[PDB]
Amino acid sequence: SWGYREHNGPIHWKEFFPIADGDQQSPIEIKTKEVKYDSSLRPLSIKYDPSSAKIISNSGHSFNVDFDDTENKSVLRGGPLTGSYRLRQVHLHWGSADDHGSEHIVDGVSYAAELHVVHWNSDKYPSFVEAAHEPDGLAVLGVFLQIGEPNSQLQKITDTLDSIKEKGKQTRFTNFDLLSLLPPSWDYWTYPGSLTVPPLLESVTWIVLKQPINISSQQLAKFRSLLCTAEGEAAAFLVSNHRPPQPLKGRKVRASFH
Ligand SMILES: COC(=O)c1ccc(SCCc2ccccc2)c(S(N)(=O)=O)c1
Ligand SMILES: [Zn+2]
């Protein structure tokens, strides 16, 4: 099974998942001087109910906060999107070093880490699964994390990480104010792309927030203490879980701001 180790890592994903070599793969390098300001883009409009979060788990590839996507309590609207996209899940990417952890890279700069908020198009598709397979199916909001002062909005998550050391472990997790974790400014870049983990489906409209949020070194280190292995299996740590940037192949990266 795929992972981020020598033998199963990004460079090998294409053996098992051919679309790894597609023309709309993510993440990318965002070169700010080449991005175009699009006055036709709309402001992001976000409503995230703290009662939506239910469960935190170790997938073996990140932690995953799972949200009740039965109805439309928690949604993303606006930006480049047509209609309403329903909140499904949150996870984080990091690397083994604090200066090289994000998936998206801005003018050569890699952040300490990158939070992904995953949503699906409930206005057009009946379920996350059906949406995941369409070009306008999914929308992922990306937030960069930079090293600095500890972030009290991450305490809720970090406090759970011991209980989910092993791959597969899960713990109830509710009253999670995801809105308060986002940066104060919602200016963004957007481009059409893919999942950054197998199955690597090209169904994602990426919305990458310009403004990072803080994390301490000590907070980030706690994530690398998660295992990519299950109970009663040789232990290996998830020290790194980001995919290298992929070729743009002529796609247009747009900015909500000038
Ligand atoms: C290391 O990162 C992850 O663990 C991770 C998990 C889920 C997802 S999205 C849902 C994947 C999925 C699986 C099966 C079917 C349809 C969608 C992503 S991402 N970076 O937004 O592309 C990362
Ligand atoms: Zn992700």
Coordinates of C-alpha atoms and ligand atoms in Angstrom, one line a residue:
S1 CA 0.0 0.0 0.0
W2 CA 1.1 3.6 -0.8
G3 CA 2.8 5.9 1.7
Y4 CA 5.7 8.3 2.0
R5 CA 8.6 5.9 2.6
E6 CA 11.4 5.0 0.1
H7 CA 9.7 2.1 -1.5
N8 CA 6.0 3.3 -1.4
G9 CA 6.5 7.1 -1.7
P10 CA 5.3 9.8 -4.2
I11 CA 7.8 8.8 -6.9
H12 CA 6.3 5.3 -7.0
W13 CA 2.6 6.2 -6.8
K14 CA 2.3 6.2 -10.6
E15 CA 3.0 2.4 -10.7
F16 CA -0.4 1.8 -8.9
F17 CA -2.3 5.0 -9.8
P18 CA -1.6 6.0 -13.5
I19 CA -3.3 9.4 -13.2
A20 CA -0.2 10.4 -11.1
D21 CA 1.2 11.4 -14.5
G22 CA -1.9 13.5 -15.6
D23 CA -2.1 17.0 -16.8
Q24 CA -3.9 18.4 -13.8
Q25 CA -1.9 17.1 -10.8
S26 CA -1.4 18.9 -7.5
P27 CA 0.3 20.5 -5.6
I28 CA 2.1 23.1 -7.6
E29 CA 4.6 26.0 -7.3
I30 CA 2.8 29.3 -7.2
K31 CA 4.9 32.0 -8.8
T32 CA 3.2 35.2 -7.6
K33 CA 4.5 37.4 -10.5
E34 CA 2.9 35.0 -13.0
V35 CA -0.5 34.6 -11.4
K36 CA -3.3 36.7 -12.9
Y37 CA -5.7 38.8 -10.8
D38 CA -9.3 37.9 -11.9
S39 CA -11.9 40.5 -11.1
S40 CA -14.5 37.9 -11.9
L41 CA -13.5 35.8 -8.9
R42 CA -15.8 36.1 -5.9
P43 CA -15.1 36.4 -2.1
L44 CA -15.0 33.2 0.0
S45 CA -18.1 32.8 2.2
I46 CA -17.6 30.2 4.9
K47 CA -19.9 28.8 7.5
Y48 CA -18.4 26.1 9.7
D49 CA -20.6 24.8 12.6
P50 CA -18.5 23.7 15.6
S51 CA -21.1 20.9 16.1
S52 CA -20.2 19.4 12.7
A53 CA -16.9 17.7 13.8
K54 CA -17.4 14.1 15.1
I55 CA -14.2 12.0 15.1
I56 CA -10.5 12.4 14.9
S57 CA -8.5 9.4 13.5
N58 CA -5.1 8.3 12.3
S59 CA -5.4 7.2 8.6
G60 CA -1.8 6.2 8.5
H61 CA -1.2 9.2 6.2
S62 CA -2.3 12.1 8.5
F63 CA -4.8 12.7 11.2
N64 CA -8.3 13.1 9.8
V65 CA -11.0 15.1 11.5
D66 CA -14.4 13.8 10.1
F67 CA -17.5 16.0 9.9
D68 CA -21.2 15.0 9.6
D69 CA -21.9 15.8 6.0
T70 CA -25.6 14.6 6.2
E71 CA -26.8 18.1 5.6
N72 CA -25.6 21.7 5.0
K73 CA -24.7 23.0 8.4
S74 CA -21.0 23.5 7.3
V75 CA -20.4 24.9 3.8
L76 CA -18.0 26.8 1.5
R77 CA -19.6 29.2 -1.1
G78 CA -18.1 31.9 -3.3
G79 CA -14.5 32.0 -4.5
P80 CA -14.2 30.3 -7.9
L81 CA -17.0 27.9 -7.0
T82 CA -20.5 27.6 -8.5
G83 CA -23.0 26.7 -5.8
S84 CA -22.4 25.2 -2.3
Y85 CA -19.7 22.8 -1.2
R86 CA -20.2 20.7 1.9
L87 CA -17.5 20.2 4.6
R88 CA -16.2 16.6 4.7
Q89 CA -12.8 16.4 6.4
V90 CA -9.6 18.2 7.6
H91 CA -6.1 16.9 7.6
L92 CA -2.5 18.3 7.7
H93 CA 0.7 17.9 5.7
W94 CA 4.2 18.4 7.1
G95 CA 7.8 17.4 6.3
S96 CA 10.7 16.1 8.4
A97 CA 12.1 19.7 8.6
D98 CA 10.3 22.9 9.7
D99 CA 11.4 24.8 6.5
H100 CA 10.1 22.2 4.0
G101 CA 6.6 20.9 5.0
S102 CA 3.9 22.4 2.8
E103 CA 2.6 20.9 -0.4
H104 CA 2.1 24.2 -2.3
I105 CA 5.2 26.4 -2.5
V106 CA 5.0 30.2 -2.9
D107 CA 8.0 31.7 -4.8
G108 CA 10.2 28.9 -3.6
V109 CA 9.1 29.3 0.0
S110 CA 7.9 26.1 1.7
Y111 CA 5.9 26.6 4.9
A112 CA 6.3 24.4 8.0
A113 CA 3.0 22.7 7.2
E114 CA -0.3 22.9 5.3
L115 CA -3.9 22.3 6.5
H116 CA -6.4 21.0 3.9
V117 CA -10.1 21.5 4.4
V118 CA -11.9 19.1 2.0
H119 CA -15.4 19.9 0.6
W120 CA -17.8 18.4 -2.0
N121 CA -20.4 19.8 -4.4
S122 CA -23.7 18.8 -2.9
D123 CA -25.6 21.1 -5.3
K124 CA -24.7 18.8 -8.2
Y125 CA -23.7 15.4 -6.7
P126 CA -25.5 13.0 -4.3
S127 CA -22.5 12.0 -2.3
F128 CA -18.8 12.7 -1.6
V129 CA -17.9 9.5 -3.5
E130 CA -19.8 10.5 -6.7
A131 CA -18.4 14.1 -6.5
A132 CA -14.9 12.9 -6.0
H133 CA -15.0 11.6 -9.7
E134 CA -16.1 14.8 -11.4
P135 CA -13.9 17.8 -12.5
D136 CA -16.1 20.2 -10.4
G137 CA -16.7 17.6 -7.7
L138 CA -14.4 18.7 -4.8
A139 CA -13.0 22.0 -3.4
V140 CA -10.0 22.0 -1.0
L141 CA -9.1 25.1 1.0
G142 CA -5.4 25.2 1.8
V143 CA -4.0 27.1 4.8
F144 CA -0.2 27.4 5.3
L145 CA 1.3 27.1 8.8
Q146 CA 4.5 29.1 9.7
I147 CA 6.8 28.5 12.7
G148 CA 6.2 31.1 15.4
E149 CA 4.3 31.5 18.7
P150 CA 2.2 28.4 19.7
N151 CA -1.3 28.4 18.4
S152 CA -4.0 27.9 21.0
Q153 CA -6.4 26.9 18.2
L154 CA -4.3 23.7 17.6
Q155 CA -4.4 22.7 21.3
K156 CA -7.6 20.7 20.8
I157 CA -6.0 18.6 18.1
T158 CA -2.6 18.2 19.7
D159 CA -4.1 17.0 22.9
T160 CA -5.7 14.0 21.0
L161 CA -2.6 12.8 19.3
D162 CA -1.4 10.3 22.0
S163 CA -4.8 8.5 21.9
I164 CA -4.4 8.0 18.1
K165 CA -0.7 7.0 17.9
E166 CA -1.4 3.8 15.9
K167 CA -2.9 3.8 12.3
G168 CA -6.6 3.1 12.5
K169 CA -7.1 4.5 16.0
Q170 CA -10.0 7.0 16.4
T171 CA -11.4 9.1 19.2
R172 CA -14.6 11.2 19.5
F173 CA -13.9 14.8 18.7
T174 CA -16.6 17.5 18.7
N175 CA -17.2 21.2 19.5
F176 CA -14.4 22.1 17.0
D177 CA -14.3 25.7 15.9
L178 CA -12.6 25.3 12.6
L179 CA -13.5 28.9 11.6
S180 CA -11.3 30.3 14.4
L181 CA -8.3 28.3 13.0
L182 CA -8.4 30.1 9.7
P183 CA -6.3 33.3 9.1
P184 CA -8.2 36.7 9.5
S185 CA -7.8 37.4 5.7
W186 CA -9.4 35.2 3.1
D187 CA -7.5 36.4 0.0
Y188 CA -6.6 33.4 -2.2
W189 CA -5.1 31.8 -5.3
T190 CA -7.0 29.2 -7.2
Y191 CA -6.3 26.6 -10.0
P192 CA -7.8 23.3 -11.1
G193 CA -6.0 20.2 -9.8
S194 CA -6.1 16.8 -8.0
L195 CA -6.1 15.0 -4.8
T196 CA -2.5 15.0 -3.5
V197 CA -2.8 11.4 -2.2
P198 CA -3.9 8.3 -4.2
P199 CA -6.3 8.0 -5.9
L200 CA -5.0 11.3 -7.2
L201 CA -8.3 12.2 -8.9
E202 CA -8.4 15.4 -10.9
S203 CA -11.7 16.6 -9.4
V204 CA -10.4 19.4 -7.2
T205 CA -10.7 23.2 -7.3
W206 CA -7.9 24.4 -5.1
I207 CA -8.3 27.5 -3.0
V208 CA -5.0 28.4 -1.4
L209 CA -5.1 31.1 1.3
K210 CA -2.3 33.7 1.0
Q211 CA -2.0 34.5 4.7
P212 CA -0.4 31.7 7.0
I213 CA -1.3 30.8 10.6
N214 CA 1.2 30.2 13.3
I215 CA 2.4 26.9 14.8
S216 CA 5.2 26.3 17.3
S217 CA 8.1 23.9 16.6
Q218 CA 7.0 21.8 19.6
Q219 CA 3.4 21.6 18.3
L220 CA 4.5 20.5 14.8
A221 CA 6.9 17.8 16.3
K222 CA 3.9 16.2 17.9
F223 CA 2.4 15.3 14.5
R224 CA 5.6 13.4 13.4
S225 CA 5.0 11.1 16.5
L226 CA 2.0 9.6 14.7
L227 CA 2.6 6.1 13.2
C228 CA 2.0 5.1 9.6
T229 CA 1.6 1.5 10.9
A230 CA -1.2 -0.4 12.7
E231 CA -1.3 -2.1 16.1
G232 CA 0.9 -5.3 16.2
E233 CA 3.0 -4.3 13.2
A234 CA 6.6 -3.0 12.9
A235 CA 6.5 0.7 14.0
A236 CA 7.3 3.4 11.5
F237 CA 6.7 7.1 12.1
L238 CA 4.9 9.6 9.9
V239 CA 7.8 12.1 9.8
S240 CA 6.8 13.4 6.4
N241 CA 3.5 13.3 4.4
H242 CA 3.7 15.9 1.6
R243 CA 3.8 15.3 -2.2
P244 CA 6.5 17.2 -4.3
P245 CA 5.1 19.9 -6.7
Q246 CA 3.8 18.7 -10.1
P247 CA 4.1 20.4 -13.5
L248 CA 1.6 23.2 -14.2
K249 CA 1.1 22.0 -17.8
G250 CA -0.5 25.2 -19.0
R251 CA -3.2 25.6 -16.3
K252 CA -4.0 29.1 -15.2
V253 CA -3.4 30.1 -11.5
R254 CA -5.6 33.0 -10.6
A255 CA -5.6 35.5 -7.7
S256 CA -8.7 37.0 -5.9
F257 CA -6.6 40.1 -5.1
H258 CA -4.3 42.7 -6.6
Ligands
LIG1 C1 -1.5 13.0 3.7 O1 -2.8 13.5 3.4 C2 -3.9 12.7 3.5 O2 -4.0 11.8 4.4 C3 -5.1 13.0 2.7 C4 -6.3 12.3 2.9 C5 -7.5 12.6 2.1 C6 -7.4 13.7 1.1 S1 -8.8 14.1 0.1 C7 -9.8 12.6 0.2 C8 -9.1 11.3 -0.4 C9 -10.1 10.4 -1.1 C10 -9.9 9.0 -0.9 C11 -10.8 8.0 -1.6 C12 -11.8 8.5 -2.4 C13 -11.9 9.9 -2.7 C14 -11.1 10.8 -2.0 C15 -6.2 14.4 0.9 S2 -5.9 15.8 -0.3 N1 -4.3 16.4 0.1 O3 -6.8 17.0 0.0 O4 -5.9 15.4 -1.7 C16 -5.1 14.1 1.7
ZN2 ZN -4.2 17.2 1.7

